[PDB]
């Protein structure tokens, strides 16, 4: 059973989404049948008499837990085991129960988290709950790490007291609520020094493994409740097994028959096809500045730089761009000569009308042309606004790959929702290596329903939501349909250059009805359905074809002279040779090029000395 229903968790912090009944519905639709929250769990503005029972399934929050401004009288989190805390609230805490009361001082009353065993990182804040009961008696030093216990801030002010004490079969208090089942079970401050981590009792025969996070059911690494750092698919490892093992006997590096790549917090057999496989053995999103990606036998890798490295262009939401939430006119200058945006790309409607809260000027719609040199995006592309003047995504006409290593909402890797464009115009897009694609809500946009997106997707299980665009019959009846000479596979626009693949052949970036064989102005040949011009020194054949390749070596007949295998315009007269000896040739009867006489220094118009006079 190596699967647990995961969700993404909210990051609104304090934000109310609509009304008191539209927020709850949006809360319910995310934390439903979820077992492992991959993000942050936030429970805000839950008015009285609402069934919050669906939270009895969450077993591990990988971020912080914020419970603020609620009024429901009972929040059942009876199966939460660990609050790891990879991101703090108020940049210090991991669990926080802030002002949580109704008008007449009533409000949140019980919070039975009786399975909460460890907060890996962070502190706790309990302020301004006047109706809370029994949570004032817990021993938070069994949960929080002693490294963080100096930051905690508890403030219990239940001036009502209309709630019973807890069963005497509980450690001097330490009760999460009412009854004998809802007290607290301690696993860190009872057992003896022989244990290095946590335990199951007081005997030294109970110490759990080092890598058990909450508790354990057995002394070995395959019995931890929740793993602490990694997970080797049945055990709580500390580092994924290396791919190569040192040999103390021969001073060399062997191979490991149980080596595995580290991907996130799991040890997998092989990396995902859209990640960078480092040499140590690890799936990463992008490797250090000393290297650069390199396609190799299908998988991605990166080798050391060749002298000076290239421009590493961070994307919105990584590195120096973590406070910026758009492509605002301040930071647009940094994407000046980029080719691969190693991150995301957001284009929000607050970049064009200007933000005041962060003192940024409006973005001139002409300043988007800086992106026309971007070719890869190792993430997602979220376009949420485009200048009303334009009619297609012109600044991305050179985009070629969207790796989808990090995705919007953890699901999508392309979002073109609610623009005013007529056609997409991404005519150079060839692959979306992961993540769904949503192109919907656009007022007057078609040509999007023709492309067979099952080709671009490079992973099984990719969907596409394309709804509420310009009607199918609405623009079909107005000539707005894919062009004539294009394969029915689709098109990104009406112009012949906008179609992916052609009906017959192509002249570079444009499709055509037939190559210029026999006739035409430039002679051409056909390979892989492409029309390439014959070397200029190919005599225009009005009968059959003209050439069978690019080079003058395939010319059926040379137009001027012929220097051996090649078709030349004029026989060589000054070309470097062996022993620093120059080279001079002449054209005989059949316009064939033959070498001069060893003595002829000023060249020769004929064979030997009888050819070059004074």
């Amino acid at each position: 059973l190596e699967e647990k229903k995961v969700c993404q968790g909210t990051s609104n912090k304090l934000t109310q989404l609509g009304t008191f009944e539209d927020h709850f519905l949006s809360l319910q639709r995310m934390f439903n049948n979820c077992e492992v929250v991959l993000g942050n769990l936030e429970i805000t503005y839950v008015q009285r008499n609402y069934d919050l029972s669906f939270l009895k399934t969450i077993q591990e929050v990988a971020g912080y837990v914020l419970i603020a401004l609620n009024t429901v009288e009972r929040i059942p989190l009876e199966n939460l085991q660990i609050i790891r805390g990879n991101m703090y609230y108020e940049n210090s805490y991991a669990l926080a129960v802030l002002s949580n009361y109704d008008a007449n001082k009533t409000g949140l009353k019980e919070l039975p988290m009786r399975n909460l065993q460890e907060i890996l990182h962070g502190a706790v804040r309990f302020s301004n709950n006047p109706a809370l009961c029994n949570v004032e008696s817990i021993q938070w030093r069994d949960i929080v790490s002693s490294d963080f216990l100096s930051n905690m801030s508890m403030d219990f002010q239940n001036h009502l007291g209309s709630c019973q004490k807890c069963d005497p079969s509980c450690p001097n208090g330490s009760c999460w609520g009412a009854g004998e089942e809802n007290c607290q079970k301690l696993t860190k401050i009872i057992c003896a020094q022989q244990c290095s981590g946590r335990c199951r009792g007081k005997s030294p025969s109970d110490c759990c493994h080092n890598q058990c996070a909450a508790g354990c059911t057995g002394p070995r690494e395959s019995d931890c409740l929740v793993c602490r750092k990694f997970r080797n698919e049945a055990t709580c490892k500390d580092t994924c097994p290396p791919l190569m093992l040192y040999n103390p006997t021969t001073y060399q590096m062997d191979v490991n028959p149980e080596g595995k790549y580290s991907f996130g917090a799991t040890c997998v057999k092989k990396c995902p096809r859209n990640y960078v496989v480092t040499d140590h053995g690890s799936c990463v999103r992008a490797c250090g500045a000393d290297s650069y990606e390199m396609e190799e036998d299908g998988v991605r890798k990166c080798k050391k730089c060749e002298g000076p490295c290239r421009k590493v262009c961070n994307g919105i939401g990584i590195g120096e761009f973590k406070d910026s939430l758009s492509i605002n006119a301040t930071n647009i200058k940094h994407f000046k000569n980029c080719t691969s945006i190693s991150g995301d790309l957001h284009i929000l409607p607050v970049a064009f009308r200007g933000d005041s809260f962060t003192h940024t000027p409006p973005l001139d719609p002409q300043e988007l042309d800086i992106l026309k040199t971007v070719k890869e995006i190792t993430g997602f592309l979220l376009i949420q606004a485009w200048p009303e003047n334009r009619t297609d995504l012109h600044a991305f006409e050179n985009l070629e790959i969207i790796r989808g290593r990090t995705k919007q909402h953890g699901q999508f890797s392309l979002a073109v929702v609610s623009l005013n464009i007529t056609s997409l115009g991404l005519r150079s897009l060839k692959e979306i290596s992961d993540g769904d694609v949503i192109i919907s809500g656009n007022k007057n946009l078609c040509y999007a329903n023709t492309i067979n997106w099952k080709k671009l997707f490079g992973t099984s299980g990719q969907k596409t939501k394309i709804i509420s665009n310009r009607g199918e019959n609405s623009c079909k009846a107005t000539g707005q349909v894919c062009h004539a000479l294009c394969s029915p596979e689709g098109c990104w626009g009406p112009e012949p250059r906008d179609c992916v693949s052609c009906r017959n052949v192509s002249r570079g970036r444009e499709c055509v009805d037939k190559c210029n064989l026999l006739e035409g102005e430039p002679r051409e040949f056909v390979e892989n359905s492409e029309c390439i011009q014959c070397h200029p020194e190919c005599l225009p054949q009005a009968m059959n074809i003209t050439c069978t390749g690019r080079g003058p070596d395939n010319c059926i007949q040379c137009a001027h002279y012929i220097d051996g295998p090649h078709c030349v315009k004029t026989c060589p007269a000054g070309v470097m040779g062996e022993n620093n000896t120059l080279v001079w040739k002449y054209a005989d009867a059949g316009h064939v090029c033959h070498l001069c006489h060893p003595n002829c220094t000023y060249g020769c118009t004929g064979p030997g000395l009888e050819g070059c006079p004074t």
Binding site: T15, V350, K465
Partner: protein, 47 residues
């Protein structure tokens, strides 16, 4: 409601609201948009 500094803070036609208990400011995003300051569209549950 919110002071003149916190103006244009909420992006998608949301209204800035001031919380007197925690002494902080928060948004009131309209139905459809999510995020700290109503910046993102909810792609999963609408177009």
């Amino acid at each position: 409601e919110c002071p003149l500094s916190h103006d244009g803070y909420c992006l998608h036609d949301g209204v800035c609201m001031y919380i007197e208990a925690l002494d902080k400011y928060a948004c009131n995003c309209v139905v459809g948009y999510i995020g700290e300051r109503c910046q993102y569209r909810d792609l999963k549950w609408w177009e």
